[PDB]
Amino acid sequence: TKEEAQETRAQIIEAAERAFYKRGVARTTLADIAELAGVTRGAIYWHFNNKAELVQALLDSLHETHDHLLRASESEDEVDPLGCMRKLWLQVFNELVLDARTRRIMEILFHKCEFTDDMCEIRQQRQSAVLDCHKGITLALANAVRRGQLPGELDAERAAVAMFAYVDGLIRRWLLLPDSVDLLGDVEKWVDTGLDMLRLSPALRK
Amino acid sequence: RTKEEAQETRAQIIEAAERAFYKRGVARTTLADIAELAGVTRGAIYWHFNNKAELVQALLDSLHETHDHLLRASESEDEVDPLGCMRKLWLQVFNELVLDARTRRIMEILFHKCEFTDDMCEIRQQRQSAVLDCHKGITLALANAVRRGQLPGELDAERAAVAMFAYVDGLIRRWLLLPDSVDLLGDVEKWVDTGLDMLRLSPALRK
Numbered sequence: 001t002k003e004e005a006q007e008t009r010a011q012i013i014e015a016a017e018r019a020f021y022k023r024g025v026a027r028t029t030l031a032d033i034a035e036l037a038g039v040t041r042g043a044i045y046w047h048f049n050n051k052a053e054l055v056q057a058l059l060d061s062l063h064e065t066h067d068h069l070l071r072a073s074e075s076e077d078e079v080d081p082l083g084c085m086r087k088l089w090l091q092v093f094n095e096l097v098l099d100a101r102t103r104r105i106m107e108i109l110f111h112k113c114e115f116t117d118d119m120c121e122i123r124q125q126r127q128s129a130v131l132d133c134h135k136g137i138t139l140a141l142a143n144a145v146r147r148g149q150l151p152g153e154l155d156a157e158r159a160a161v162a163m164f165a166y167v168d169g170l171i172r173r174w175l176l177l178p179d180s181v182d183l184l185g186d187v188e189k190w191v192d193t194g195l196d197m198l199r200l201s202p203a204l205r206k
Numbered sequence: 207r208t209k210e211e212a213q214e215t216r217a218q219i220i221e222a223a224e225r226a227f228y229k230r231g232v233a234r235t236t237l238a239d240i241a242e243l244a245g246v247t248r249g250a251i252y253w254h255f256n257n258k259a260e261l262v263q264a265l266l267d268s269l270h271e272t273h274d275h276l277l278r279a280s281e282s283e284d285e286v287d288p289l290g291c292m293r294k295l296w297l298q299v300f301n302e303l304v305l306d307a308r309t310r311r312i313m314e315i316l317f318h319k320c321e322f323t324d325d326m327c328e329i330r331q332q333r334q335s336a337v338l339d340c341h342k343g344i345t346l347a348l349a350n351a352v353r354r355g356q357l358p359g360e361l362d363a364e365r366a367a368v369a370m371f372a373y374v375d376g377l378i379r380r381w382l383l384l385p386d387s388v389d390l391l392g393d394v395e396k397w398v399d400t401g402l403d404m405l406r407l408s409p410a411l412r413k
């Protein structure tokens with residue numbers, strides 16, 4: 001049955017989040033996740049080959065809320081690629097602080113997920129996700145340069161690395177020390193600080 | 207002598223813990239495993255460390271020594287060029303990461319092979335303490351540079367410290383995950399200056 005299968009996969013993913021958040025990925029097994037989800041008869045193995053597929057599902061689930069702002073910032077036909085990128089990072093930070101699911105998937109991926117040789121797909125799939133995002137940020141920065149919103153001589157690739165590094169570090173800083181960063185109250189200041197680096201730093205120019 | 211032999215054995219244990227944590231991760235590695243790798247008895251390893259968290263803290267603490275003279279130079283009110291010492295500090299941070307196998311392996315362990323779990327809550331708390339401490343230091347050096355006129359007078363030192371640390375921390379982990387994406391050694395001056403340019407030119411980082 002169609003709906004029941006998606007029914008069950010969502011139960012498993014939701015239970016996987018609870019299990020990974022409590023006990024970490026390394027020591028959690030699929031059998032333990034099936035126990036939390038209330039699924040039996042090997043159902044979990046029909047939806048996932050291994051834990052890495054479950055981790056990838058959680059990582060893929062983050063790309064959904066922002067799909068439209070990603071598309072807009074990457075499109076050559078977009079009139080305001082820089083403004084759309086600003087709206088994107090504003091949404092990324094807002095969802096992190098406001099959404100329990102997002103914050104806790106990211107906490108799982110960043111602080112409860114080990115890169116090991118017996119589970120090499122986790123690091124490899126993290127490399128691919130970061131690389132994919134870098135391509136998107138680089139392309140959106142190149143659209144802003146062409147629109148006259150960023151320096152004509154900007155090194156879009158290095159500026160994409162710089163922006164990602166800043167956003168990445170800020171998120172992890174808020175996850176580790178929520179009290180230290182009023183990410184929600186000053187979200188615009190935090191987004192503009194990184195954008196300002198791309199706009200003004202002479203080091204980021206070719 | 208007792209002291210010399212114990213310090214010798216402690217170093218063997220720490221070195222073997224790096225090899226064990228790096229290969230199998232912190233969560234599934236036991237002190238018994240580390241003892242076998244280090245070639246010491248289980249009683250020996252348990253004399254030096256009560257649990258796995260204490261060993262992780264040992265690695266986490268060793269990172270502070272190499273930079274200890276440059277962070278205190280930028281932190282000193284009497285430093286004539288605090289902004290300059292900060293630049294040399296971050297240059298040295300990135301230089302050691304790329305050149306030093308040990309520092310790279312430890313940071314890879316701490317950032318990518320060590321889970322925050324209720325089963326070992328000391329890990330997260332020690333990371334919280336280390337970041338909070340570094341934040342204070344960075345805030346000191348930024349206020350000195352502002353007072354010395356090297357940074358904007360109306361700069362929010364607290365937020366600027368956060369932003370600089372976020373950039374450096376994010377860059378480190380990007381190079382750890384994708385080394386060929388960041389020539390962190392040949393362009394090290396560019397990568398440091400990019401973040402310093404952020405604190406010095408961003409109108410958002412001002413009150």
Ligand SMILES: O=C1CC[C@@]2(O)[C@@H]3Cc4ccc(O)c5c4[C@]2(CCN3CC2CC2)[C@@H]1O5
Pocket residue numbers: 114115116117119120121122123124314318
């Ligand atoms: O972080 C890292 C960095 C180093 C490694 O990347 C590489 C291969 C690999 C593959 C998958 C992993 O999860 C993982 C590794 C690591 C295990 C050891 N290797 C080194 C050998 C390819 C040369 C580890 O953890």
Ligand SMILES: O=C1CC[C@@]2(O)[C@@H]3Cc4ccc(O)c5c4[C@]2(CCN3CC2CC2)[C@@H]1O5
Pocket residue numbers: 062063066067070092110126129130133164167168169171
């Ligand atoms: O791999 C990835 C894929 C997607 C992301 O790259 C970006 C921003 C970001 C910044 C730092 C991370 O460690 C991290 C992310 C990710 C979290 C959220 N995303 C924003 C864009 C997907 C909308 C994640 O994990």
Ligand SMILES: O=C1CC[C@@]2(O)[C@@H]3Cc4ccc(O)c5c4[C@]2(CCN3CC2CC2)[C@@H]1O5
Pocket residue numbers: 107175321322323324326327328330
């Ligand atoms: O990131 C975090 C933030 C939240 C927690 O900090 C605290 C206690 C704790 C202790 C050690 C951890 O490794 C760890 C946690 C967390 C697990 C449970 N929480 C208790 C409070 C959320 C109710 C987690 O991961």
Ligand SMILES: O=C1CC[C@@]2(O)[C@@H]3Cc4ccc(O)c5c4[C@]2(CCN3CC2CC2)[C@@H]1O5
Pocket residue numbers: 266269270273277295299333336337340374375378
């Ligand atoms: O990546 C890094 C590189 C530099 C540090 O490693 C060391 C000590 C430390 C300990 C735990 C961290 O999470 C952390 C750090 C860092 C914070 C402070 N440092 C001292 C070195 C700046 C002189 C940071 O972030």
Ligand SMILES: [Mg+2]
Pocket residue numbers: 061062063064065066095102
């Ligand atoms: Mg979402």
Ligand SMILES: [Mg+2]
Pocket residue numbers: 268269270271272273302309
């Ligand atoms: Mg050192």
